Paper text:
Monoubiquitination of histones [name]-K120 ([name]) and H2A-K119 (H2AK119ub) play opposing roles in transcription regulation and chromatin compaction. Our results suggest a mechanism by which [name] serves as a gatekeeper to the acidic patch and point to distinct roles for histone H2AK119 and H2BK120 ubiquitination in regulating protein binding to nucleosomes.
To investigate whether [name] adopts positions that could interfere with the binding of proteins that interact with the nucleosome acidic patch, we determined cryoEM structures of nucleosome core particles containing Widom 601 DNA (147 bp) and ubiquitinated histone [name]-K120. The density maps revealed four distinct positions of [name] on the nucleosome surface, denoted H2Bub positions 1, 2, 3, and 4. In H2Bub position 1, [name] sits nearest the center of the histone octamer core, and progressively further away in positions 2–4. The secondary structure elements of [name] in H2Bub positions 1–3 were sufficiently resolved to unambiguously position and orient the [name] within the electron density maps. In all three positions, the [name] beta sheet is oriented towards the nucleosome surface, while the alpha helix faces away. At a probe radius of 5 Å, the acidic patch surface area occluded by [name] in H2Bub positions 1, 2, and 3 is 1235, 891, and 405 Å2, respectively. In our cryoEM structures of [name] nucleosomes, the [name] hydrophobic patch is oriented towards the nucleosome surface and could also potentially mediate van der Waals contacts with histone residues. H2Bub position 3, in particular, positions the I44 hydrophobic patch near [name] residues 45–48. To visualize representative structures in the MD simulation, we used K-means clustering of [name] throughout the trajectory to obtain representative snapshots consistent with H2Bub positions 3, 4, and 5.
Author numbering:
A (entry chain E): 37 to 135
B (entry chain K): 1 to 76
C (entry chain D): 26 to 122
D (entry chain C): 9 to 119
E (entry chain F): 23 to 102
F (entry chain A): 37 to 134
G (entry chain B): 20 to 102
H (entry chain G): 10 to 118
The structure:
DNA sequence: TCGGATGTATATATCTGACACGTGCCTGGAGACTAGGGAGTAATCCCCTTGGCGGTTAAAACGCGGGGGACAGCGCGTACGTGCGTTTAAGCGGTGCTAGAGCTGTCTACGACCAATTGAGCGGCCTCGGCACCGGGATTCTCGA
DNA sequence: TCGAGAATCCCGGTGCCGAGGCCGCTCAATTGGTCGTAGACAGCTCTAGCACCGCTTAAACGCACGTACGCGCTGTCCCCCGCGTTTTAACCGCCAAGGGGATTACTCCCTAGTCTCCAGGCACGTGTCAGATATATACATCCGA
């Protein structure tokens, strides 16, 4: 019979692997396209240095990681295992970001 | 037992010492061979400082080891 | 070819590293990180000292303001050790001439 | 009328960071009308002490991994594992740093 | 120009996995995309304001550092 | 036979009454004594101005009220009405305090 | 005069009134100790900073300006007491 | 001879002191030199902000059939507006109080 | 035996209040709060302008630095209205 | 589904302490003039950004079977809300007293500024060793039975 | 409880590119002397912070009782997870073209500094009315039958 793992082991393996390493997790070109589209709304015919895009990517990734950690804590507090949008909303409300 | 000790200038000196010997005799011997007074020398072995009262046997040093010497003027 | 000179804390950081760890290198990214750290700490301490001097309607920045700002900024053990090091350095410098 | 040999101000204090550069930066930084003659020595000593502490911790962390060079991962590991240094850099993110390897206890497999 | 869709689902899954999450529901992705859009909007607006005051046409990496620092989110290692 | 209110009405009455007012809640003299005792550990034989004590009381009360609001939100999030210490711990942890 | 056992001066009804203003309806029996500890920590930090500010000026009396400056240094500035 | 003096605020048509702002900028250790147009801009901005806050507070006070303004009215005016609350999101006002809200769950059935 | 002089912003705030609401008073604590608010905003704007001037290797602060600092600090509608008011004040002053 | 009892909102007299306003005056702001450097403007160099084309391969997208987790319902017993009689100390009004905050002279040591100059620090080259990468075997886990 | 597959780690050999060191030089930190004033020390004045005593009454305490909610247990149903197959666009390498950043030289005008003069803002004193208390009354609301 084909060999299958129980649901849950591969998630832990991925957790270990992805928090042991220090590489970026989002492809560069889609992020650059998104940054250009967002910045277009403020001033027309702009130009970007590559290091600026790299810094933006690093800051965004760090912010998202921290937010996800706090969301996981909030989800665990309510006797659950899966994160839900209400957890993100509660974390952002308590942190003072959302009004 | 034979140990080589290096300086910040790459200057390497061979030194014959016994495992039971403690480091005060080692600094006295480098006074004998160099004359640097025994206060401005600091000896680092693989990133750890050496306590003066403790002996070489407790550090588990091996033959043909590589000890590093740095000089702190401290003069002022 | 004319190139403008740039100032950085590279050589001093390397000297400190070679004083602490006799055999250990460093890469460029770590150098930039350490430079940014030094600049940030310097700016914070200088700003706090300037504000403290302005509070007491005085027009001079002395070592007293630096000591008070250091005590206000850093945590406990770090503040104690930094104060000891600073006072030792100042006494050493004053004694010699 | 024979000028004596020049001796740097940092040499007299027995320091490594430049006293004169700090003095000039304080003078030109728009901090106060006048600057005393003792503040740069204090500031240089404090900066040197902090740099030495950070470098020692980072070098140890690098040595545990069997490497002879310091990369931002080692600096991040050294900073985040010390409570006081973590308190100091509370709102600072380091490029190419990563995160500390922790896992919540409940998520671990049963039995 | 729906380039917000370029942040694909496995990327969010990888970010959450690094964050330490074991199970993910099916509606997290929209919230993540909205949050990312808002954050990028704020930071880019500040950087563009700095560049406009500088009387230039290309944003550098240094005014991005200024914009990040203004929000109490200091960044190290980019020539700060 | 004596008239009694069901559990919960007086709580809402007090909530409305104390949200409609602005005066301080903690007594003055015990707070002043606590402030003096706390300040003793740093320098002996100190003296205080009244306005400093008033400012300290105001700031402490505002901080406590905000913390209680966040704790109530945390308690509500988990299908509960009663607040517990773990809610306070979670709120303080998320806020970014050690 | 040396003072001792003054943290208990913050009585249970005071905490109840604070919670009522905060919008709480039901309170467990273990909240009071946590509230006392949190208040003690906050007061310790603020008073330490204020005492340092006072000590710098070669004075012996803590003024409202010192408390205002100490509060501002921690990003919780206060209005209505000068400065 | 010499002509009669006219304040710079009168020339700018403001109610805030231009000269005091100029002196504070010069003596505040902000820059080596100060231009001739900054005080006017600063005074205009400060006057506009003060006028907005005062108008909102006065409306709030007139709601409560009172003739004078107390800190409660200032707190109510500030916390009821979006941008003003965002500007003062980390400021506490003495003798202010709180906003009368109650979560919908705790209400009786 | 008179004390020294203490500067404040009470006169101008009262003038503005009488300009907006012609039949309303104000108490002492409200005046203190307004004074603190004015000083705090002034300090923020001045500090931001000084930093901005420092960044571009410049040795003076003009109306441009104030305008950019106002744009950076305040939210949208307030920033737009304040910019319009400051521009109007500057052109009116330079006209005479 | 009604009806009694309690808490809260509403109308009126009254008396007090803080708000609004008038005066003197003195210190800070306004008018007039110089002199010098910071900044605006034009011209040149070339580096770094943008755009396009081919391939190749890893990552993204889609479908399917199923086991484990979220959620509703039910029973119980204990902690917490409410009311009452008792005890405790906070609050208010005076009276004493002096430590220390605040202001004024003076006089000296300390820092800014300028001219000569020389050794520290930065830019360019290069050279080789530490680290990255590929192939292989030993080890350590997980999931039926 | 026990054993067959997968995933990971330790080892050895090979190549490359960037980090550590050497020269040359130019601009900034020293050195020496002078001059002006910021602040440190001494003296005096007066206010507010600490201490004490008495009295009143409002708030904190302890206790009894009932009931509602926090918590554990059980069953269902469905929706993420792991795995296989197909598709696509990211990435790397290379090649052109040009706009805008970065210096450099010159010149006009904008601001700092000084002197003289005078009026606006601050401290002091005073009258009076806006509102806080007290009293009484009318209405909204909650729990039981």
């Amino acid at each position: 019979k084909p060999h299958r793992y129980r649901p849950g082991t591969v998630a832990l393996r991925e957790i270990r692997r992805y928090q042991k390493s220090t590489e970026l997790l989002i492809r560069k070109l889609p992020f650059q396209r998104l940054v250009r589209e967002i910045a277009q709304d403020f001033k027309t015919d702009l130009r970007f240095q590559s290091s600026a895009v790299m810094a933006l990517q690093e800051a965004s990734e760090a912010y998202l990681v921290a937010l996800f950690e706090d969301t996981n804590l909030c989800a665990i507090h309510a006797k659950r295992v899966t994160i839900m949008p209400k957890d993100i909303q509660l974390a952002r409300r308590i942190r003072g970001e959302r009004a | 037992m034979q140990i080589f000790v290096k300086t910040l200038t790459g200057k390497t000196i061979t030194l014959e010492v016994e495992p039971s010997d403690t480091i005060e005799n080692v600094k006295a011997k480098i006074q004998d061979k160099e004359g640097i007074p025994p206060d401005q020398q600091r000896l680092i072995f693989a990133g750890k400082q050496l306590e003066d009262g403790r002996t070489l046997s407790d550090y588990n040093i091996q033959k043909e080891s590589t000890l590093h010497l740095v000089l702190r003027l401290r003069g002022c | 070819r004319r190139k403008t000179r740039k100032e950085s804390y590279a050589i001093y950081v390397y000297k400190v590293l070679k004083q602490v760890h006799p055999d250990t290198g460093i890469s460029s990214k770590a150098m930039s990180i350490m430079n940014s750290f030094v600049n940030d700490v310097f700016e914070r301490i200088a700003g706090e000292a300037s504000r403290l001097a302005h509070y007491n309607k005085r027009s001079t920045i002395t070592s007293r303001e630096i000591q008070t700002a250091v005590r206000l900024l850093l945590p406990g053990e770090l503040a104690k050790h930094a104060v000891s090091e600073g006072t030792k350095a100042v006494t050493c410098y004053t004694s010699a001439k | 009328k024979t000028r004596a040999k020049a001796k740097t101000r940092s040499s007299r204090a027995g320091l490594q960071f430049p006293v004169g550069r700090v003095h000039r930066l304080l003078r030109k930084g728009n901090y106060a009308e006048r600057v005393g003659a003792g503040a740069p020595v204090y500031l240089a000593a404090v900066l040197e002490y902090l740099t030495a502490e950070i470098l020692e911790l980072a070098g140890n962390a690098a040595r545990d991994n069997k490497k002879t060079r310091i990369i931002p991962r080692h600096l991040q590991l050294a900073v985040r594992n010390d409570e006081e240094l973590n308190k100091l850099l509370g709102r600072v993110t380091i490029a190419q740093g990563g995160v500390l390897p922790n896992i919540q206890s409940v998520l671990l497999p049963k039995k | 120009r729906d380039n917000i869709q370029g942040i694909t689902k496995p990327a969010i899954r990888r970010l959450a996995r690094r964050g330490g999450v074991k199970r993910i529901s099916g509606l997290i992705y929209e919230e993540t995309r909205g949050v990312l859009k808002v954050f990028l909007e704020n930071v880019i607006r500040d950087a563009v304001t700095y560049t406009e005051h500088a009387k230039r046409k290309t944003v550098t990496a240094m005014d991005v550092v200024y914009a990040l620092k203004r929000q109490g989110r200091t960044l190290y290692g980019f020539g700060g």
